[PDB]
Protein backbone atom coordinates (compact mmCIF):
# COMPACT_ATOMS: atom_id res chain seq x y z
CA UNK A 1 0.00 0.00 0.00
CA UNK A 2 3.14 2.19 0.11
CA UNK A 3 4.64 4.01 -2.87
CA UNK A 4 7.45 3.08 -5.32
CA UNK A 5 10.48 5.35 -4.84
CA UNK A 6 11.15 6.39 -8.43
CA UNK A 7 12.11 9.76 -6.98
CA UNK A 8 15.09 8.18 -5.29
CA UNK A 9 16.13 7.02 -8.78
CA UNK A 10 15.30 9.88 -11.10
CA UNK A 11 15.84 12.77 -8.69
CA UNK A 12 19.09 11.32 -7.32
CA UNK A 13 21.80 13.93 -6.79
CA UNK A 14 24.50 11.58 -8.13
CA UNK A 15 24.39 8.99 -10.91
CA UNK A 16 26.60 6.00 -11.65
CA UNK A 17 29.41 5.64 -14.13
CA UNK A 18 27.97 3.51 -16.93
CA UNK A 19 30.71 0.94 -16.54
CA UNK A 20 29.66 0.47 -12.91
CA UNK A 21 26.02 1.19 -13.69
CA UNK A 22 23.46 1.07 -10.94
CA UNK A 23 20.46 -1.20 -10.63
CA UNK A 24 17.69 -0.68 -8.08
CA UNK A 25 15.02 -3.31 -7.58
CA UNK A 26 11.46 -2.11 -7.20
CA UNK A 27 9.61 -4.61 -5.01
CA UNK A 28 5.95 -4.52 -3.89
CA UNK A 29 4.62 -0.96 -4.14
CA UNK A 30 2.56 1.22 -6.53
CA UNK A 31 3.75 4.22 -8.56
CA UNK A 32 2.37 5.72 -11.73
CA UNK A 33 4.12 5.36 -15.05
CA UNK A 34 2.02 8.00 -16.82
CA UNK A 35 3.48 10.54 -14.36
CA UNK A 36 6.67 10.43 -16.40
CA UNK A 37 4.78 9.79 -19.65
CA UNK A 38 3.49 13.34 -19.19
CA UNK A 39 6.67 14.59 -17.52
CA UNK A 40 8.24 15.66 -20.85
CA UNK A 41 11.43 16.54 -19.06
CA UNK A 42 12.56 13.52 -21.10
CA UNK A 43 14.33 13.54 -24.47
CA UNK A 44 14.52 9.76 -24.80
CA UNK A 45 11.55 7.67 -23.64
CA UNK A 46 11.27 4.45 -25.64
CA UNK A 47 9.49 1.31 -24.50
CA UNK A 48 9.82 -2.16 -25.96
CA UNK A 49 7.35 -4.13 -23.89
CA UNK A 50 4.19 -2.04 -24.08
CA UNK A 51 2.95 1.52 -23.87
CA UNK A 52 3.25 2.82 -20.28
CA UNK A 53 -0.54 2.67 -20.20
CA UNK A 54 -1.37 0.36 -17.30
CA UNK A 55 -2.25 3.11 -14.75
CA UNK A 56 -1.65 1.02 -11.53
CA UNK A 57 0.91 -1.55 -10.45
CA UNK A 58 -1.05 -3.49 -13.06
CA UNK A 59 0.30 -7.01 -13.69
CA UNK A 60 3.90 -6.73 -12.46
CA UNK A 61 5.96 -8.75 -9.98
CA UNK A 62 9.40 -7.05 -10.07
CA UNK A 63 10.71 -3.85 -11.66
CA UNK A 64 14.43 -3.17 -12.14
CA UNK A 65 15.56 0.42 -12.53
CA UNK A 66 19.01 0.62 -14.08
CA UNK A 67 20.51 4.10 -14.14
CA UNK A 68 23.83 5.62 -15.26
CA UNK A 69 25.42 8.46 -17.28
CA UNK A 70 26.80 8.14 -20.83
CA UNK A 71 27.50 10.86 -23.37
CA UNK A 72 24.91 12.21 -25.70
CA UNK A 73 25.59 10.23 -28.88
CA UNK A 74 25.76 6.99 -26.93
CA UNK A 75 22.10 6.92 -25.86
CA UNK A 76 21.10 5.23 -29.14
CA UNK A 77 23.13 2.25 -27.85
CA UNK A 78 20.70 1.62 -24.99
CA UNK A 79 18.45 -0.55 -27.14
CA UNK A 80 18.14 -4.19 -28.11
CA UNK A 81 20.84 -5.10 -30.55
CA UNK A 82 23.38 -2.30 -30.49
CA UNK A 83 27.11 -2.82 -30.78
CA UNK A 84 29.15 0.23 -29.68
CA UNK A 85 31.50 0.74 -26.73
CA UNK A 86 28.64 1.07 -24.33
CA UNK A 87 26.67 -1.89 -25.64
CA UNK A 88 29.74 -4.07 -26.05
CA UNK A 89 31.64 -3.19 -22.82
CA UNK A 90 29.49 -1.38 -20.37
CA UNK A 91 25.77 -2.04 -20.51
CA UNK A 92 24.10 -4.56 -22.88
CA UNK A 93 20.36 -5.09 -23.03
CA UNK A 94 18.92 -8.46 -24.01
CA UNK A 95 17.71 -8.69 -27.59
CA UNK A 96 14.28 -9.65 -26.24
CA UNK A 97 14.36 -6.77 -23.77
CA UNK A 98 10.93 -5.62 -22.72
CA UNK A 99 11.16 -2.39 -20.78
CA UNK A 100 11.63 1.35 -21.22
CA UNK A 101 14.76 3.37 -21.93
CA UNK A 102 14.51 6.84 -20.43
CA UNK A 103 17.17 9.47 -21.03
CA UNK A 104 17.40 13.19 -20.45
CA UNK A 105 20.07 15.85 -20.77
CA UNK A 106 22.08 16.49 -17.65
CA UNK A 107 24.50 19.02 -19.03
CA UNK A 108 23.47 21.40 -16.33
CA UNK A 109 23.97 18.90 -13.48
CA UNK A 110 26.89 16.64 -14.48
CA UNK A 111 29.01 18.94 -16.59
CA UNK A 112 31.74 20.98 -14.91
CA UNK A 113 33.88 23.92 -15.92
CA UNK A 114 37.28 22.27 -16.01
CA UNK A 115 35.57 18.96 -16.82
CA UNK A 116 33.86 16.33 -14.65
CA UNK A 117 36.28 13.44 -14.49
CA UNK A 118 34.02 11.53 -12.06
CA UNK A 119 32.07 9.81 -14.83
CA UNK A 120 33.79 6.85 -16.46
CA UNK A 121 33.29 4.18 -19.11
CA UNK A 122 35.13 0.96 -20.00
CA UNK A 123 37.04 1.13 -23.25
CA UNK A 124 38.41 -2.34 -24.02
CA UNK A 125 37.36 -5.77 -22.81
CA UNK A 126 38.53 -9.24 -23.83
CA UNK A 127 35.00 -10.22 -24.85
CA UNK A 128 31.63 -8.50 -25.03
CA UNK A 129 29.34 -8.50 -22.03
CA UNK A 130 26.29 -10.73 -21.92
CA UNK A 131 23.17 -8.58 -21.38
CA UNK A 132 22.95 -7.15 -17.85
CA UNK A 133 26.36 -8.64 -17.14
CA UNK A 134 28.66 -6.13 -15.46
CA UNK A 135 32.37 -5.41 -15.11
CA UNK A 136 33.73 -3.19 -12.32
CA UNK A 137 37.32 -4.39 -12.67
CA UNK A 138 40.15 -1.85 -12.81
CA UNK A 139 43.06 -4.03 -13.90
CA UNK A 140 45.92 -2.21 -15.62
CA UNK A 141 47.13 -4.15 -18.69
CA UNK A 142 50.74 -5.10 -19.57
CA UNK A 143 50.84 -1.63 -18.86
CA UNK A 144 47.79 0.41 -19.99
CA UNK A 145 44.49 1.35 -18.27
CA UNK A 146 40.96 0.23 -19.28
CA UNK A 147 38.71 3.08 -18.12
CA UNK A 148 38.38 6.55 -19.60
CA UNK A 149 36.72 9.71 -18.40
CA UNK A 150 34.13 11.66 -20.31
CA UNK A 151 35.24 14.84 -18.51
CA UNK A 152 31.96 16.57 -19.30
CA UNK A 153 32.24 20.30 -19.64
CA UNK A 154 29.18 22.33 -20.63
CA UNK A 155 30.45 23.83 -23.90
CA UNK A 156 30.76 20.36 -25.50
CA UNK A 157 28.14 19.73 -28.16
CA UNK A 158 24.97 17.85 -27.24
CA UNK A 159 26.69 14.83 -28.74
CA UNK A 160 29.23 14.97 -25.93
CA UNK A 161 27.24 16.38 -23.04
CA UNK A 162 26.12 14.11 -20.19
CA UNK A 163 22.88 12.13 -20.46
CA UNK A 164 21.16 10.51 -17.50
CA UNK A 165 19.63 7.17 -18.40
CA UNK A 166 17.05 5.10 -16.57
CA UNK A 167 16.30 1.63 -17.93
CA UNK A 168 13.23 -0.05 -16.49
CA UNK A 169 13.15 -3.82 -16.84
CA UNK A 170 9.98 -5.71 -15.98
CA UNK A 171 9.83 -9.18 -14.39
CA UNK A 172 6.66 -11.26 -14.63
CA UNK A 173 7.90 -14.47 -12.98
CA UNK A 174 5.82 -15.66 -10.01
Amino acid at each position, epitope marked *: TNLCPFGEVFNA*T*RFASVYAWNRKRISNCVADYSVLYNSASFSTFKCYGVSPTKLNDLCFTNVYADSFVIRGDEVRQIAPGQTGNIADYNYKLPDDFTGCVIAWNSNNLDS*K*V*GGN*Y*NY*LYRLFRKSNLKPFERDIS*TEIYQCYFP*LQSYGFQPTYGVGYQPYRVVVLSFLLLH
Partner: antibody
Protein backbone atom coordinates in the same frame (compact mmCIF):
# COMPACT_ATOMS: atom_id res chain seq x y z
CA UNK B 1 42.53 4.59 5.32
CA UNK B 2 45.56 6.41 6.72
CA UNK B 3 47.58 9.28 5.21
CA UNK B 4 50.98 10.11 6.72
CA UNK B 5 52.97 12.99 5.23
CA UNK B 6 56.63 14.00 5.43
CA UNK B 7 57.68 15.92 8.53
CA UNK B 8 58.32 19.60 7.81
CA UNK B 9 60.69 21.52 5.57
CA UNK B 10 61.93 25.10 5.19
CA UNK B 11 63.81 26.39 2.13
CA UNK B 12 65.07 29.57 0.43
CA UNK B 13 63.04 31.46 -2.21
CA UNK B 14 63.52 30.22 -5.75
CA UNK B 15 64.23 26.71 -4.48
CA UNK B 16 61.75 23.84 -4.58
CA UNK B 17 60.16 21.56 -2.00
CA UNK B 18 59.11 17.94 -2.47
CA UNK B 19 56.48 16.61 -0.08
CA UNK B 20 55.53 12.94 0.07
CA UNK B 21 52.30 11.57 1.46
CA UNK B 22 52.25 7.80 1.98
CA UNK B 23 48.70 6.47 2.31
CA UNK B 24 47.73 3.10 3.79
CA UNK B 25 44.67 0.91 4.13
CA UNK B 26 43.18 1.97 0.81
CA UNK B 27 41.07 -0.99 -0.22
CA UNK B 28 41.05 -0.17 -3.95
CA UNK B 29 43.69 1.13 -6.41
CA UNK B 30 41.91 4.08 -8.09
CA UNK B 31 41.14 7.09 -5.88
CA UNK B 32 41.79 10.81 -6.02
CA UNK B 33 44.65 12.51 -4.19
CA UNK B 34 44.59 16.28 -3.84
CA UNK B 35 46.97 18.77 -2.34
CA UNK B 36 45.50 21.74 -0.50
CA UNK B 37 47.51 24.31 1.47
CA UNK B 38 46.68 26.69 4.33
CA UNK B 39 48.60 29.94 4.48
CA UNK B 40 48.93 31.38 8.02
CA UNK B 41 45.47 31.77 9.57
CA UNK B 42 44.20 32.08 6.00
CA UNK B 43 41.81 30.35 3.62
CA UNK B 44 42.33 26.79 2.44
CA UNK B 45 43.61 26.65 -1.15
CA UNK B 46 43.08 23.70 -3.49
CA UNK B 47 46.08 23.23 -5.76
CA UNK B 48 45.46 20.08 -7.76
CA UNK B 49 45.11 16.36 -7.70
CA UNK B 50 46.36 13.22 -9.36
CA UNK B 51 44.59 9.97 -10.22
CA UNK B 52 45.80 6.88 -8.39
CA UNK B 53 45.35 4.79 -11.57
CA UNK B 54 46.50 6.37 -14.87
CA UNK B 55 48.48 9.09 -13.08
CA UNK B 56 46.51 11.95 -14.67
CA UNK B 57 46.74 15.37 -13.04
CA UNK B 58 44.45 18.42 -12.91
CA UNK B 59 46.23 21.52 -11.61
CA UNK B 60 44.82 24.82 -10.46
CA UNK B 61 45.87 27.56 -12.87
CA UNK B 62 47.19 29.60 -9.92
CA UNK B 63 50.15 27.19 -9.71
CA UNK B 64 50.27 25.79 -13.26
CA UNK B 65 53.81 25.08 -14.43
CA UNK B 66 55.08 25.58 -10.86
CA UNK B 67 53.84 22.38 -9.22
CA UNK B 68 54.24 18.72 -10.21
CA UNK B 69 52.32 15.81 -8.65
CA UNK B 70 53.92 12.37 -8.90
CA UNK B 71 52.18 9.13 -7.94
CA UNK B 72 54.48 6.25 -6.91
CA UNK B 73 52.06 3.35 -7.15
CA UNK B 74 54.67 0.81 -5.99
CA UNK B 75 55.20 2.31 -2.53
CA UNK B 76 51.66 3.79 -2.33
CA UNK B 77 53.02 7.29 -1.96
CA UNK B 78 51.97 10.64 -3.44
CA UNK B 79 54.50 13.39 -4.10
CA UNK B 80 53.93 17.11 -4.53
CA UNK B 81 56.68 19.46 -5.71
CA UNK B 82 56.45 23.26 -5.99
CA UNK B 83 59.33 25.09 -7.66
CA UNK B 84 60.62 28.67 -7.62
CA UNK B 85 58.92 29.63 -4.36
CA UNK B 86 57.86 33.26 -3.89
CA UNK B 87 57.35 33.32 -0.08
CA UNK B 88 53.69 33.84 -0.75
CA UNK B 89 54.03 30.06 -0.44
CA UNK B 90 54.65 29.68 3.28
CA UNK B 91 51.84 27.40 4.42
CA UNK B 92 50.90 24.04 5.75
CA UNK B 93 50.43 21.56 2.91
CA UNK B 94 47.82 18.82 3.26
CA UNK B 95 47.26 15.89 0.97
CA UNK B 96 43.58 15.02 0.86
CA UNK B 97 41.66 12.49 -1.20
CA UNK B 98 38.96 9.88 -1.14
CA UNK B 99 35.84 8.48 -2.74
CA UNK B 100 37.20 4.94 -2.44
CA UNK B 101 34.48 2.65 -3.80
CA UNK B 102 32.93 5.43 -5.88
CA UNK B 103 35.45 7.68 -7.57
CA UNK B 104 35.00 11.36 -6.99
CA UNK B 105 37.45 14.25 -7.37
CA UNK B 106 34.91 16.52 -5.74
CA UNK B 107 35.39 16.51 -1.97
CA UNK B 108 38.08 15.34 0.45
CA UNK B 109 37.43 12.18 2.52
CA UNK B 110 40.72 11.61 4.38
CA UNK B 111 43.49 14.11 5.18
CA UNK B 112 47.15 13.78 6.00
CA UNK B 113 48.70 15.19 9.11
CA UNK B 114 49.72 18.34 7.23
CA UNK B 115 53.28 19.36 6.39
CA UNK B 116 54.54 22.86 7.12
CA UNK B 117 56.73 24.66 4.59
CA UNK B 118 58.39 28.04 5.16
CA UNK B 119 59.78 30.35 2.48
CA UNK B 120 62.15 33.07 3.68
CA UNK B 121 65.54 34.63 2.98
CA UNK C 1 36.48 31.37 -10.66
CA UNK C 2 33.94 30.81 -7.86
CA UNK C 3 33.91 32.71 -4.53
CA UNK C 4 32.41 31.37 -1.26
CA UNK C 5 31.56 33.70 1.65
CA UNK C 6 30.36 32.21 4.92
CA UNK C 7 28.13 34.55 6.79
CA UNK C 8 28.77 34.71 10.60
CA UNK C 9 32.56 35.02 10.60
CA UNK C 10 32.53 34.23 14.32
CA UNK C 11 29.86 32.79 16.59
CA UNK C 12 29.56 32.55 20.37
CA UNK C 13 27.29 29.80 21.60
CA UNK C 14 26.87 27.54 24.60
CA UNK C 15 26.71 23.75 24.80
CA UNK C 16 23.18 22.69 23.95
CA UNK C 17 22.47 25.65 21.65
CA UNK C 18 21.10 25.10 18.17
CA UNK C 19 23.73 26.51 15.84
CA UNK C 20 23.46 27.47 12.15
CA UNK C 21 26.37 28.72 10.04
CA UNK C 22 25.68 29.94 6.49
CA UNK C 23 27.59 29.59 3.22
CA UNK C 24 26.76 31.59 0.05
CA UNK C 25 28.26 31.47 -3.44
CA UNK C 26 29.02 33.87 -6.28
CA UNK C 27 27.26 31.57 -8.77
CA UNK C 28 24.97 28.59 -8.16
CA UNK C 29 26.74 25.29 -7.49
CA UNK C 30 23.60 23.37 -7.59
CA UNK C 31 24.30 20.93 -4.70
CA UNK C 32 28.02 20.23 -5.12
CA UNK C 33 29.03 21.39 -1.65
CA UNK C 34 31.03 20.03 1.30
CA UNK C 35 31.44 21.29 4.87
CA UNK C 36 34.58 20.81 6.96
CA UNK C 37 35.59 21.11 10.64
CA UNK C 38 39.07 22.34 11.69
CA UNK C 39 40.62 22.66 15.13
CA UNK C 40 43.90 24.49 15.77
CA UNK C 41 46.97 22.53 14.72
CA UNK C 42 44.92 19.68 13.26
CA UNK C 43 43.95 18.81 9.67
CA UNK C 44 40.35 19.42 8.56
CA UNK C 45 37.61 16.78 8.82
CA UNK C 46 34.82 16.18 6.32
CA UNK C 47 31.32 16.55 7.77
CA UNK C 48 28.74 16.93 4.99
CA UNK C 49 29.05 16.43 1.22
CA UNK C 50 26.64 17.10 -1.69
CA UNK C 51 25.13 19.63 0.67
CA UNK C 52 23.28 17.19 2.93
CA UNK C 53 24.96 13.80 2.91
CA UNK C 54 26.29 13.17 6.40
CA UNK C 55 29.75 11.65 6.30
CA UNK C 56 30.19 8.25 7.89
CA UNK C 57 30.29 8.27 11.66
CA UNK C 58 29.98 12.05 11.95
CA UNK C 59 27.27 12.58 14.63
CA UNK C 60 23.74 13.05 13.34
CA UNK C 61 23.51 16.50 14.99
CA UNK C 62 25.27 17.95 11.95
CA UNK C 63 22.97 18.49 8.98
CA UNK C 64 23.59 20.23 5.68
CA UNK C 65 20.97 21.98 3.60
CA UNK C 66 20.43 24.27 0.70
CA UNK C 67 20.78 24.03 -3.06
CA UNK C 68 21.82 26.36 -5.78
CA UNK C 69 23.36 29.37 -4.16
CA UNK C 70 22.73 29.50 -0.39
CA UNK C 71 23.64 26.72 2.01
CA UNK C 72 23.48 26.05 5.71
CA UNK C 73 25.01 23.73 8.31
CA UNK C 74 22.74 23.36 11.32
CA UNK C 75 23.93 21.73 14.55
CA UNK C 76 20.89 20.45 16.43
CA UNK C 77 22.52 20.77 19.87
CA UNK C 78 26.10 21.75 20.49
CA UNK C 79 28.65 19.55 22.32
CA UNK C 80 32.04 20.59 23.78
CA UNK C 81 34.20 19.22 20.96
CA UNK C 82 32.13 21.12 18.40
CA UNK C 83 34.10 24.28 19.13
CA UNK C 84 36.09 24.64 15.92
CA UNK C 85 36.39 26.56 12.71
CA UNK C 86 34.14 25.36 9.88
CA UNK C 87 34.67 25.70 6.12
CA UNK C 88 32.57 25.12 3.03
CA UNK C 89 33.90 24.08 -0.33
CA UNK C 90 32.34 24.07 -3.80
CA UNK C 91 33.05 21.38 -6.40
CA UNK C 92 30.90 22.83 -9.21
CA UNK C 93 33.72 24.92 -10.62
CA UNK C 94 37.37 24.78 -11.02
CA UNK C 95 39.69 25.74 -8.98
CA UNK C 96 37.86 24.20 -6.09
CA UNK C 97 37.54 26.95 -3.54
CA UNK C 98 36.67 27.26 0.14
CA UNK C 99 35.07 29.90 2.33
CA UNK C 100 36.97 31.96 4.94
CA UNK C 101 35.38 29.96 7.71
CA UNK C 102 33.44 30.37 10.92
CA UNK C 103 35.14 30.10 14.27
CA UNK C 104 32.47 28.84 16.67
CA UNK C 105 33.59 29.89 20.14
CA UNK C 106 32.39 29.61 23.71
CA UNK C 107 29.86 32.22 24.79
CA UNK C 108 30.94 33.80 28.09
Amino acid sequence: VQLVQSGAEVKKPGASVKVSCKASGYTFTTYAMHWVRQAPGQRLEWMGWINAGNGNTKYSQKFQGRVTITRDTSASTAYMELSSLRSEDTAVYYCAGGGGRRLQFDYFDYWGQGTLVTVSS
Amino acid sequence: DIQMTQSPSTLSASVGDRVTITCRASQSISSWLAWYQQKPGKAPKLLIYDASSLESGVPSRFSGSGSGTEFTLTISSLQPDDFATYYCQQYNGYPWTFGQGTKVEIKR
